[PDB]
mmCIF file of N, CA and C in Angstrom:
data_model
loop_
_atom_site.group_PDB
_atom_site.id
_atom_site.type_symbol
_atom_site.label_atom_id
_atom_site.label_comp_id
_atom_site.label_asym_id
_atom_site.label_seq_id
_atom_site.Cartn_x
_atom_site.Cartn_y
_atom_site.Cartn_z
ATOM 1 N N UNK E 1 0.833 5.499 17.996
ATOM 2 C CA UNK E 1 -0.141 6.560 18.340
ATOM 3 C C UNK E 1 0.172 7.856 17.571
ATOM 4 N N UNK E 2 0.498 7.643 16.015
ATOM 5 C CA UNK E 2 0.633 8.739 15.469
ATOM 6 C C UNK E 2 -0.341 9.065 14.369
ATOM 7 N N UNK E 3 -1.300 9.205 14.919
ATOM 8 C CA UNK E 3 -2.680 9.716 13.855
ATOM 9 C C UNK E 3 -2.705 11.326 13.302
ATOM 10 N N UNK E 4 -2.353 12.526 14.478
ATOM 11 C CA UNK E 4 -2.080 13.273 13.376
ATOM 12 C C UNK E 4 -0.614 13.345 12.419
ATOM 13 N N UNK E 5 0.597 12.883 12.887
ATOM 14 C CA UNK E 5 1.444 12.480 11.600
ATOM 15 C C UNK E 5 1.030 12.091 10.506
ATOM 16 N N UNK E 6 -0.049 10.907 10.738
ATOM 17 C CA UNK E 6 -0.344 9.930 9.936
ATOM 18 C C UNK E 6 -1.271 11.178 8.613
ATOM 19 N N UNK E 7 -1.613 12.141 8.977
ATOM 20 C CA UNK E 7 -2.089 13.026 7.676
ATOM 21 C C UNK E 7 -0.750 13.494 7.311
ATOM 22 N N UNK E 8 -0.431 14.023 7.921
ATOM 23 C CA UNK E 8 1.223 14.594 7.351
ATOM 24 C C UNK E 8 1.897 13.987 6.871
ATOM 25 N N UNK E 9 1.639 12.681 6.737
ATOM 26 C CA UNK E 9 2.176 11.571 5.741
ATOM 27 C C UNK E 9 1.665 11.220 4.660
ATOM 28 N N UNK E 10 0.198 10.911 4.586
ATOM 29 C CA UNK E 10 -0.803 11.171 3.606
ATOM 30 C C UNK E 10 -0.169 11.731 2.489
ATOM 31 N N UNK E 11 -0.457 13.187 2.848
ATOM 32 C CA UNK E 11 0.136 14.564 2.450
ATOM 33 C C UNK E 11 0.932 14.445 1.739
ATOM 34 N N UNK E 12 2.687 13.552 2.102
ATOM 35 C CA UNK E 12 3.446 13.858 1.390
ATOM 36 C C UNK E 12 3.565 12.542 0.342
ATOM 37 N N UNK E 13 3.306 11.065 1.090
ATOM 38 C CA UNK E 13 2.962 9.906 0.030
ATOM 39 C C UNK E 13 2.181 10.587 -0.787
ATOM 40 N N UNK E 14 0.887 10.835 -0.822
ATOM 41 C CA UNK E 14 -0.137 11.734 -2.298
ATOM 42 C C UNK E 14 0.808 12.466 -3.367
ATOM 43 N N UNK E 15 2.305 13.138 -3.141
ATOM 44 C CA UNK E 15 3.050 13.215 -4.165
ATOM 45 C C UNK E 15 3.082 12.380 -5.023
ATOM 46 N N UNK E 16 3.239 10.782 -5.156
ATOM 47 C CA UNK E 16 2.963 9.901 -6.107
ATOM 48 C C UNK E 16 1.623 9.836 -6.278
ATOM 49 N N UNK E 17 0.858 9.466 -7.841
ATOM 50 C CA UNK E 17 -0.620 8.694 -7.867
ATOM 51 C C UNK E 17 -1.606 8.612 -7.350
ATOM 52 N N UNK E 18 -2.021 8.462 -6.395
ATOM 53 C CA UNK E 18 -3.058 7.906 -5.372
ATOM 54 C C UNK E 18 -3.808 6.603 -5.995
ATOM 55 N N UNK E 19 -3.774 6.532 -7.423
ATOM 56 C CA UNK E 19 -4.452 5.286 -8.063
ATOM 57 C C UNK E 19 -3.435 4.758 -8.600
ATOM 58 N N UNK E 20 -2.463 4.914 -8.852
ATOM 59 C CA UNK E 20 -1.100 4.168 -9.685
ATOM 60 C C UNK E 20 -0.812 3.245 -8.422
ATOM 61 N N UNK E 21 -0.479 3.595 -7.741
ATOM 62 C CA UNK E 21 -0.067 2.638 -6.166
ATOM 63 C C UNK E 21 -1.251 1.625 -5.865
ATOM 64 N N UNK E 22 -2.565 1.974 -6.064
ATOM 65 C CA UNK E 22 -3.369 0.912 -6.034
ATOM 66 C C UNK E 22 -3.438 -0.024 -6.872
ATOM 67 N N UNK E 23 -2.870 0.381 -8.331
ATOM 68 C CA UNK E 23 -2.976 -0.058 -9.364
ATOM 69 C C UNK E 23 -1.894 -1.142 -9.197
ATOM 70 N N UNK E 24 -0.666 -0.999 -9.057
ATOM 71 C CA UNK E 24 0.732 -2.071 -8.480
ATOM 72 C C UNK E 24 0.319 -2.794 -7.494
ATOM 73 N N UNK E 25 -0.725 -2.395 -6.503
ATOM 74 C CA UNK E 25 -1.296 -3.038 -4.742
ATOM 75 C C UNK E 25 -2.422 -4.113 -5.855
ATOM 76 N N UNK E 26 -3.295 -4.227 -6.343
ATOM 77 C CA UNK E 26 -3.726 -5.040 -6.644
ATOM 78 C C UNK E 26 -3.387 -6.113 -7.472
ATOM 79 N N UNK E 27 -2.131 -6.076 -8.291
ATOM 80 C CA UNK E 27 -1.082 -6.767 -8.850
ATOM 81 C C UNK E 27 0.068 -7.730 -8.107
ATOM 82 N N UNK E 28 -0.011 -7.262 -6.633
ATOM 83 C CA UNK E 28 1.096 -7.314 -5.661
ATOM 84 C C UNK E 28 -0.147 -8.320 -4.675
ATOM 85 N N UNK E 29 -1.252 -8.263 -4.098
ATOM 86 C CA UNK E 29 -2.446 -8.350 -2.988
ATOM 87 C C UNK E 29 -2.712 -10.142 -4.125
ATOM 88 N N UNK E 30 -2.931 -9.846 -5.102
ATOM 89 C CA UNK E 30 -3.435 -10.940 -5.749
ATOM 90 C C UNK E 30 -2.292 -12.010 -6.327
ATOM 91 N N UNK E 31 -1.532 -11.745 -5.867
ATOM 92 C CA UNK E 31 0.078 -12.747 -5.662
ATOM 93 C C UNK E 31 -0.275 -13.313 -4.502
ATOM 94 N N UNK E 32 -0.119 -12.267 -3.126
ATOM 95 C CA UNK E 32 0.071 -13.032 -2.273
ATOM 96 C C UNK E 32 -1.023 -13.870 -1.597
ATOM 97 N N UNK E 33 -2.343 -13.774 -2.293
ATOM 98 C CA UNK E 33 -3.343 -14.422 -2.216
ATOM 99 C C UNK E 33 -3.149 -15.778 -2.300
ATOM 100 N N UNK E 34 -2.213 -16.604 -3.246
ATOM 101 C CA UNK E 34 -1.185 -17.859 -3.528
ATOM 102 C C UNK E 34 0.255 -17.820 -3.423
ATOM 103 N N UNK E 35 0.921 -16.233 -2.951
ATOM 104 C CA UNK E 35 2.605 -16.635 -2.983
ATOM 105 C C UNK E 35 2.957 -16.500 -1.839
ATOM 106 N N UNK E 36 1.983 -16.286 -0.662
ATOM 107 C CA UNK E 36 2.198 -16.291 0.857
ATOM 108 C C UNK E 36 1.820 -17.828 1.291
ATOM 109 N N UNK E 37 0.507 -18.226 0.819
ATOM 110 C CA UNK E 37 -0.046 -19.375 1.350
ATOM 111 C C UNK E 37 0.938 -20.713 1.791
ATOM 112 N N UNK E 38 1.789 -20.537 0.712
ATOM 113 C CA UNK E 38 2.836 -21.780 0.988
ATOM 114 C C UNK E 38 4.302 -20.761 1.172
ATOM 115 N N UNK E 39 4.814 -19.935 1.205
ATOM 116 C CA UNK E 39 5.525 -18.872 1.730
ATOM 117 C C UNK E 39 5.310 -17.758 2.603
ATOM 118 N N UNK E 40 5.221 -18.320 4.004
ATOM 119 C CA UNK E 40 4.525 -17.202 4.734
ATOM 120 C C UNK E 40 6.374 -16.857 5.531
#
């Protein structure tokens, strides 16, 4: 139940990228699309 933290976190994660991290998350999301399925 920490939603306003959860901006104050925002806040300080947004120091890195905001699109570089998505950019590694869709590199990382489309692995485990096949490297979870039989490794969960």
């Amino acid at each position: 139940y920490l939603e306003r933290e959860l901006k104050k976190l925002e806040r300080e994660l947004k120091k890195l990228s905001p699109e570089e991290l998505n950019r590694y998350y869709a590199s990382l999301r489309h692995y485990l699309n096949l490297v979870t399925r039989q490794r969960y």
